[PDB]
């Protein structure tokens, strides 16, 4: 038989000739009867074929191929805890996908491997069902059906072969925690065998640091308990009969740094053996050779553990590289920002040896940038001389720009609005700008604030800030409050150390006032100014041009500038006036933000954020009352309303405010509530002491791809603001804030939502105890 | 959209939503063209239409995958002259993009990451298709591509001159030297290495560069 025409029935995805080339007999080949049977099976090697019916019409082949080509979908059901993509990964493991050579032969092999995946989760009690369901003309859906009964969880740990160390402390070392009580509720549960291997070394290192240098685990027997959850485990170990680290005989290619190496091998010969201490001490040498240029710090040891005196003797074999490994460096991930601003955010120089710290310290400054997503690097040994290691600084950069809200009259009550936004290095050019301002009937505020943080290459921070507050509090655009204020702030950044940094500047504020309120803290300041207008009216004006002198200093050994987790940065700042200022005073402050890891894996970190401030007159004067200290609302004692926490002044007996309006803005005025009415708003003190203690809380229910830059945190919020210049005779029948004990109280949670134009901090705080004159909005939305 | 239909009905709506400007639909057409029929007769032209639907909808890595797809679907195709140019034209556009261009802010000292990728593909075009209609285009891209890498590498030799790692000056300048002779920025880097030499007391080696400056005065 020799075929004149092969009949190729049933072809969708594979070609006709791709079938024909898969045929061992082509149209015109010498055809054998087993080759027809080989035409059956070698067509089945396409994998897209259900049936291949190679018949011949005498010799004329008719090959009725029935097909299982492209699987036109894959569907899932019953996998509540299990991602379908992980199951799709098992399909990717079993070589099947949407649009693939369908194989109904591997259905149970999928479901076994699904269960063997459901094994490797830490279950087995689960149903698995791949259902092959057809799709157009030969295509298919793979429907996946799951009835997940129960996982496996830490139940029991049997340790036999231990001779000293109590398994209760060992489970306390391990992550085999299996107790969350009902009235003593603590911790969590739920076994995984990948934790188990680390839990084996959590035993082992714990024996290694004790002296057990003959410690081995004999065997381990984890119970296949007849319940499809039960994980009991018998481990057999050989305790290790504690040894003494009793001498270091470090040698090798010590590169002439042997004495410095001997400082890293300053040991006690004879104390209980600690190979973990031995382990890190090698890495000190690897840092030491890393310090001295040697990026090949081959430092291996031999703990000659002497079992006759039950001791250890420490051979350490050392090899260094060469010094000048830092040949050049590369910088990557600055497709929108400047390269050289990152390069000047670095400490190791090319044309030098390896300073092992300086790449990291430069990366630490780049970690202290906070305009990044990732701080990492790639440190490529370029092959050649042992002075060729180039360093790709692979880094990723983060979001830019963030508007600040608080705007609104409905956009219907006149032309009145609020702005405010940041520029965030100005697109990575090198100019962080933050600008706000608001023009209403009640104000016209202007502000800009820009830095050239690298005005010179050291980090001279050319921080230019301006303002123009035409604050025009409206009763007739007069008679409530007038103050047009304007001026600048040019303040400069100073290198002090490489984590220490000074600030100093000067200030222009020309306030220009009219129709001034009767409340005493103004007037006690007004009389401290020596200016004594009439307080029964708001007829009173003030023109001042205070020329002050700014100063400050910053510490910097906290991690990040956008998502920190460990360390602190001290923010000392203050102001004082000059001979020539229109008021002689000062104002000093300090603000703290410590990051102390509760969990040192940083799923729980203490965030102690406190605020201090003090300012008074330099003598014969006072600090201005607008420089008094406030809290509440969005502050670190929140759940309040803004400027509600602090001292509370009283209007002097008052009349028309140059016509206080008919029963509006009552200020002991003629139009309602005359003759020593009181101001229950936080007029502020000359002393500030406010704080927030926040605690990093993990979010498990969120896709942690973006919840990793979401920081949810709990707090209590408490604080006191008061005036040391406060009177107890004109606030005798009023809130006295001469006392420091004016302590507010609040508590709650904040939610920093990571949005693509900056994170969004929204917080519900609840004022537990609120002192004199506090006013509250418990639900505050912030940036 | 557009399920297992006539492929030309998928293809007409593909060419229509291309000409509609519904590239996001035309992508979804040309996908559903090849989601059902990746064996269509214009399935390579689908990839030429996909990148056309990708690039006009600004989908450079989706174009770049379709560029890779056009290679993996047809590595012998003559319309790689589009696609290898498009491989550059993705990577020319994939490299840098910001709104600071109206202010004249240069992004040639930004990272030339896909510019280095477009340095390959535009050159792989004018190697692989040295005759194509895209070839006269891509060569002139490579003219600025080495010159974008000039002001990239010029920006750091200045920094090392500001740093004072004078070995790191001459490394960037010799890298500016040993790649592009055609840049004035290297001839402006010409005193810098020479100054770095003069700071390293290689005044004589700098005077070697000073006659190069004398030769590169014109």
């Amino acid at each position: 038989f020799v075929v004149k025409d092969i009949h190729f029935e049933g072809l969708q995805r594979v070609a006709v000739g791709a079938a024909l080339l898969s045929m061992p007999v082509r149209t015109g080949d010498t055809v054998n009867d087993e080759d027809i049977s080989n035409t059956i099976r070698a067509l089945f090697a396409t994998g897209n074929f259900e049936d291949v019916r190679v018949l011949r019409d005498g010799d004329t082949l008719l090959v009725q191929v029935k097909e299982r080509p492209t699987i036109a979908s894959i569907t899932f059901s019953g996998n509540k805890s299990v991602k379908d993509d992980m199951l799709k990964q098992n399909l990717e493991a079993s070589g099947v996908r949407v649009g693939e050579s369908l194989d109904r032969t591997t259905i149970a092999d999928i479901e076994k491997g699904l269960e063997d995946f459901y094994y490797s989760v830490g279950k087995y009690s689960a149903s698995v069902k791949a259902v092959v369901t057809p799709l157009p003309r030969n295509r298919v859906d793979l429907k996946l059906v799951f009835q997940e009964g129960v996982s496996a969880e830490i139940q029991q740990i049997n340790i036999v072969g231990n001779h000293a160390f109590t398994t209760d402390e060992l489970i306390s070392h391990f992550q085999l925690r299996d107790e969350v009580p009902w009235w003593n509720v603590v911790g969590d549960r739920k076994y995984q065998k990948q934790k188990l291997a680390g839990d084996l070394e959590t035993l082992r290192s714990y024996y290694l640091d004790r002296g057990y240098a003959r410690f081995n685990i004999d065997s381990t027997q984890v119970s296949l308990t007849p319940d499809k959850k039960g994980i009991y485990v018998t481990v057999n170990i050989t305790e290790g009969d504690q040894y003494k680290l009793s001498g270091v005989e470090v040698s090798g290619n010590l590169a002439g740094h042997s004495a410095e190496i001997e400082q890293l091998t300053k040991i006690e010969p004879g104390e209980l053996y600690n190979g973990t201490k031995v382990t890190k001490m090698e890495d000190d040498i690897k840092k030491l050779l890393g310090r001295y240029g040697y990026a090949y710090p081959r430092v291996q040891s031999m703990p000659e553990i002497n079992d006759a005196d039950k001791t250890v003797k420490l051979r350490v074999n050392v090899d260094a590289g060469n010094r000048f490994y830092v040949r050049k460096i590369r910088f990557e991930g600055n497709d929108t920002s400047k390269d050289a601003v990152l390069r000047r955010e670095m400490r190791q120089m090319e044309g030098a040896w390896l300073g092992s710290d300086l790449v990291d310290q430069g990366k630490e400054r780049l970690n202290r940038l906070g305009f990044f997503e990732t701080v990492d690097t790639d440190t490529q040994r370029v092959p050649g001389s042992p002075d060729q290691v180039d360093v790709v600084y692979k880094v990723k950069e983060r979001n830019t720009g963030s508007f600040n809200f608080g705007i609104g009259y409905g956009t219907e009550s006149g032309v009145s609005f609020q702005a405010g936004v940041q520029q965030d290095n100005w697109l990575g050019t090198g100019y962080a700008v933050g600008i706000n301002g608001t023009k209403n009937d009640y104000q016209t505020y202007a502000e800009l604030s820009v830095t050239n943080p690298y005005f010179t290459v050291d980090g001279v921070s050319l921080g230019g800030r301006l303002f123009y507050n035409d604050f025009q509090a409206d009763d007739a655009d007069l008679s409530d409050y007038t103050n047009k204020s304007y001026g600048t702030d040019v303040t400069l950044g100073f290198p002090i150390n490489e984590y220490n940094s000074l600030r100093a500047g000067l200030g222009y504020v020309h306030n220009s006032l009219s129709n001034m309120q009767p409340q005493v803290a103004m007037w006690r300041y007004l009389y401290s100014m020596g200016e004594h207008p009439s307080t029964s009216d708001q007829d009173n004006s003030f023109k001042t041009d205070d020329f002050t002198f700014n100063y400050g200093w910053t510490y910097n050994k906290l991690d990040r500038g956008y998502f920190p987790t460990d360390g602190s940065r001290v923010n000392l700042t203050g102001k004082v006036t000059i001979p020539g200022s229109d008021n002689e005073y000062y104002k000093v402050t300090l603000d703290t933000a410590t990051y102390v890891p509760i969990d040192d894996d940083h799923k729980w970190v203490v965030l102690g954020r406190t605020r201090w401030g003090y300012g008074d007159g330099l003598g014969g004067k006072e600090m201005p009352f607008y420089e008094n200290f406030y809290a509440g609302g969005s502050s670190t004692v929140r759940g309040f309303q803004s400027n509600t926490i602090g001292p509370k002044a009283v209007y002097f007996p008052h009349q028309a405010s140059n016509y206080d309006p008919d029963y509006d803005y009552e200020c002991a005025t003629q139009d309602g509530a005359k003759d020593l009415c009181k101001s229950d708003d936080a007029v502020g003190g000359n002393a500030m002491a406010v704080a927030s203690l926040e605690f990093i809380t993990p979010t498990p229910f969120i896709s942690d791809k973006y919840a990793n830059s979401v920081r949810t945190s709990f707090f209590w919020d408490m604080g006191t603001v008061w005036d040391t210049n406060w009177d107890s005779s004109q606030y005798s029948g009023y809130p006295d804030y001469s006392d420091p004990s004016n302590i507010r109280m609040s508590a709650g949670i904040a939610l920093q939502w990571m949005s693509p134009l900056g994170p969004l901090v929204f917080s519900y705080a609840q004022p537990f105890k609120k002192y004199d004159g506090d006013k509250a909005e418990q639900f505050q939305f912030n940036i | 959209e557009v399920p297992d239909n006539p492929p030309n009905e998928i293809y007409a709506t593909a060419q229509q939503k291309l000409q509609d400007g519904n590239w996001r639909q035309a992508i979804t057409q040309l996908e559903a063209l090849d989601n059902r029929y990746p064996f269509g007769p214009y399935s390579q032209q689908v990839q030429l239409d996909l990148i056309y639907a990708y690039y006009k909808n600004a989908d450079l890595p989706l174009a770049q995958a379709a560029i890779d797809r056009f290679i993996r679907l047809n590595p012998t195709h003559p319309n790689i002259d589009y696609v290898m140019y498009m491989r550059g034209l993705t990577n020319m556009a994939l490299d840098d993009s910001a709104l600071q261009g109206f202010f004249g802010v240069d992004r040639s000292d930004r990272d030339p990451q896909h510019a280095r990728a477009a340095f390959s593909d535009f050159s792989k075009l004018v190697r692989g298709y040295p005759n194509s209609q895209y070839t006269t285009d891509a060569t002139k891209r490579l003219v600025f591509l080495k010159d974008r890498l000039a002001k990239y590498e010029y920006s750091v030799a200045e920094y090392y001159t500001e740093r004072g790692a004078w070995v790191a000056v001459v490394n960037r300048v010799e890298g500016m030297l040993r790649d592009y002779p055609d840049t004035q920025a290297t001839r402006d880097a010409l005193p810098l290495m020479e100054n770095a030499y003069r700071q390293m007391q290689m005044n004589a080696q700098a005077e070697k560069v000073a006659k190069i400056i004398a030769a590169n005065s014109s």
Binding site: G256, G293, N322, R323, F324, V326, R327, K328, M349, E350, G351, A352, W353, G384, S385, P386, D387, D458, P495, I496, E498 | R163, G164, A165, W166, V167, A168, V170, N171, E174, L177, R178, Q199, M200, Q201, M202, Q205, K208
Partner: protein, 87 residues
């Protein structure tokens, strides 16, 4: 400059006193490269000339330098161990 604090500028790829002793006039580039490696700067258009220069700046004071140039012949056989100090 009325500022006494300056963050210190450093630069290696130099020779120590031990490094100059490893080589002498006659040794090839390789012989020097077996002794010293290859420097991070050589003579690009001239002969084999191996530039190993120290540089360091202290705070408010004058910058230190130890340039040690290894001028070979074209064969690389060492011809000149050109040490150059600061200033």
């Amino acid at each position: 400059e009325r500022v006494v604090y300056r963050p210190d500028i450093n630069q290696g790829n130099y020779l120590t006193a031990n490094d100059v002793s490893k080589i002498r006039v006659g040794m090839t580039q390789q012989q020097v490269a077996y002794a010293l490696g290859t420097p991070l700067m050589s003579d690009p258009f001239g002969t084999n000339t191996w530039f190993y220069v120290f540089r360091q700046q202290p705070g408010h004071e004058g910058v230190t330098q130890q340039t040690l140039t290894l001028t070979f012949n074209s064969s690389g056989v060492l011809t000149n161990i050109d040490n150059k100090p600061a200033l």
